[PDB]
Structure formats: structure tokens, C-alpha cells
Amino acid sequence: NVAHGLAWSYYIGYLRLILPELQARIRTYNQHRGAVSQRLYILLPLDCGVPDNLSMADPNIRFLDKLPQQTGDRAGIKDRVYSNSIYELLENGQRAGTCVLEYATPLQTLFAMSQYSQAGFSREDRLEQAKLFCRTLEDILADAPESQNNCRLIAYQEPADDSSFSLSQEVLRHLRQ
Amino acid sequence: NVAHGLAWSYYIGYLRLILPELQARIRTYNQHRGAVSQRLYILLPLDCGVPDNLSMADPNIRFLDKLPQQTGDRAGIKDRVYSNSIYELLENGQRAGTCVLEYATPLQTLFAMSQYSQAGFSREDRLEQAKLFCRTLEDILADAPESQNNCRLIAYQEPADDSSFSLSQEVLRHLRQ
Ligand SMILES: O=C(O)CCC(=O)c1cc(-c2c[nH]c3c(F)cccc23)cs1
Ligand SMILES: O=C(O)CCC(=O)c1cc(-c2c[nH]c3c(F)cccc23)cs1
């Protein structure tokens, strides 16, 4: 299935390469008002909507700073640059958590494939494939050596057509545990 | 199939985002001994072997310089950095071409999946899936609006067990046309 390959490729081509150096980069930031959490938090919206600006998805998610960059030679790209962003999570006007946060970009591919006739991916299959992506990635990371309390997947389905939804509260549930 | 999804994800998640700005970045480099070619050259080894150092794959492929970086907000990563590398191609001691060059990183995922028992991808399926990746990507890019004489795929199979192979000569065949 499409989602199976995408989950494996996201581990192999991205997470396996950034997760081993992540806690070092975070420790460095914290040492040079509240330490940044030690894990990469990955947003997995099951509606596969991936905005590029996180603060427009919820005003209580506020960009704070960039992590120091990681670079490595990758596939002929000399000093390929991996950048990641740190966010503050607010709750009733209070800073309640700080963490490295981003969306899983493969879900934006599921979204786009579903709109392109030539991709052979029907619009109505997005949700099932997003669920399959989330399950496959969780199963990969549970057994992966580069994941050492390094990463937390935050999967969520914003309520059917309508009701109240808070992305920042979804992240905070995981941060608190 | 695995390769179908990976080809679509490589277009959607990478090429669609860097190709529109590529000729601008190249024009800038050329203006601020022989101009860099106007296209991104993508190496598609059908054996799915993707080294991170290109000059160790062939001594006639020599790193020259980095393209100026492109940055954009991407999935919550503020100023996500896209770096690309420029190479000189030599032939009998002469510089015969200059171009932005890198490997298609999805082929390294096909290679890795084929070695991981949990990925359900048999070792003997690599070649067929690499061929399918190459065909799917060519068909995507042929109809893609962001590809305007912007990109050239270089697919090759290094001779069965043994005979002479020159990666630099493979790239030069395409550069010359
Ligand atoms: O996506 C960004 O730009 C920030 C994260 C990053 O640098 C990378 C992501 C992947 C990747 C592996 N598989 C993918 C897929 F199936 C769809 C989209 C992206 C990817 C390789 S590197
Ligand atoms: O791979 C690098 O780090 C340099 C190029 C780059 O930045 C990106 C690549 C992709 C990607 C989309 N699909 C992929 C897949 F299936 C396997 C591996 C990578 C990718 C997203 S961004």
C-alpha cells in the first residue's frame, strides 16, 4: 500500500538520520525560563492537512526558536542541512510546554496524491491510508534503535464535521504524560 | 506498489518545491571558467546503491561548490533549508561539464527496505521496484508544470556482475545532448 512505503521512507530517509543527534542538539540549545523537551514531537493529522505555518493552525502554538542546524553529506548533497523549530504551547495565557515540533510531511503527499488523477489514489482513501501510515510508523519506531525516548507521534482526527478542537491541547496531553 | 508511492512523494515533497526556484539559484551563482548547467541532474542507480560522497563513486566527479541555499517554511519547520551541490565532470583530465547533481534518495529506501525483515520487501524485488520508480518519476515529471527543462533523470544499471563502467561518462552523455 502507498502508506506502508511512505512510513518506511520517512523513517529511513529522515528520522533514522536526525533522531540520533537530536538530544545532543536540544541539550546544546538548553545550555547556551524552562528547558525544551527531549523528544521530537511529530504531528499526524488524519485529515492529512499539513500547513506550513504552525501558529496559524492554533494561536496557542507559538514559534520560539530554531534548533542549531544539523548537517551531513547526503546522496551527493554536501552538508545537507536539517533544520528543526522549537515551539511554546500556551494554555490560558500561560506557557505550559516547550518542544521541537513539526508535521509529518508524508501526510501531505497522501493529500496531494488523492487530488491528482494520474496518481491512481481515490480521494476517499485518504483517511484509511493516513491511519495505515500512523500504525506503520509507530510499529517501526517502537523497534527502531535510533528511537530512544526520542520521538513521540501525535495522531489526531479533528471532530467529524464540527465540535471544539484544540491542537495545542492535543500536544500538551502527550507532553504531560 | 512501494515504488509508485515513493516516486509521487519525491515529486510532491521535494522536486515540486525546489525545481521552481532552481534556475534562479543557478543564474545567481553563475553571475556572482564555464557556466553551470541549468538543470538538476538526478542519479538513478538501478542497483539502488546511494553513497553519500559522490567523488568516491567516480574520481572524475569532483565537488566544486554549494548552490546558494533555498529556505521556506515547511510543515512547521521555519526556514527549512534546501542545499544542493555543484560538481565538475572530468574526462581525460579536462573539465567537460558542470552541473547540480545528486542521487534520488528514495532509491536508498528501496535498498534499506529490502534488507529489513519487517518491511515485507524481498531482496530480489529491488531491481523491479527501482525500474518502476524511474518510470513513474519520468511520467510524473513529463507532465509536471514545475519541470521546465529543469531536471534530467540519469538512470543506469552498472554492467551485470562485471565489465567497465564510468558514472561521469553516463552523466556527460546527457549533458552533451
Ligand atoms: O519534508 C521535509 O522537507 C522535512 C523533513 C525532511 O527533511 C525529509 C522528509 C523525507 C521523506 C521521507 N519520505 C517522505 C514522503 F513519503 C513524503 C515527504 C517527505 C518524505 C526525506 S527528508
Ligand atoms: O533526501 C534528502 O535528504 C535530500 C532530498 C530532500 O530534501 C527530500 C527528499 C524527500 C523524499 C520524498 N520522498 C522520499 C522517499 F520516499 C525516500 C527518501 C526521501 C524522500 C523529501 S525532502
Author numbering:
A (entry chain A), B (entry chain A): 154 to 185, 191 to 335
What did the paper state?
STING is vital for the functioning of both the innate and adaptive immune responses. When located within the intracellular endoplasmic reticulum (ER), STING undergoes structural changes and moves to the Golgi apparatus upon receiving its natural ligand, 2′3′cGMP‐AMP (cGAMP), which is synthesized by its upstream sensor, cyclic GMP‐AMP synthase (cGAS). 9 Subsequently, it recruits and triggers the phosphorylation of TANK‐binding kinase 1 (TBK1)/interferon regulatory factor 3 (IRF3) and inhibitor of nuclear factor kappa‐B kinase (IKK)/nuclear factor kappa‐B (NF‐kB), leading to the induction of type I interferons (IFN) and various proinflammatory cytokines. Herein, we developed and identified a non‐nucleotide STING agonist called DW18343.
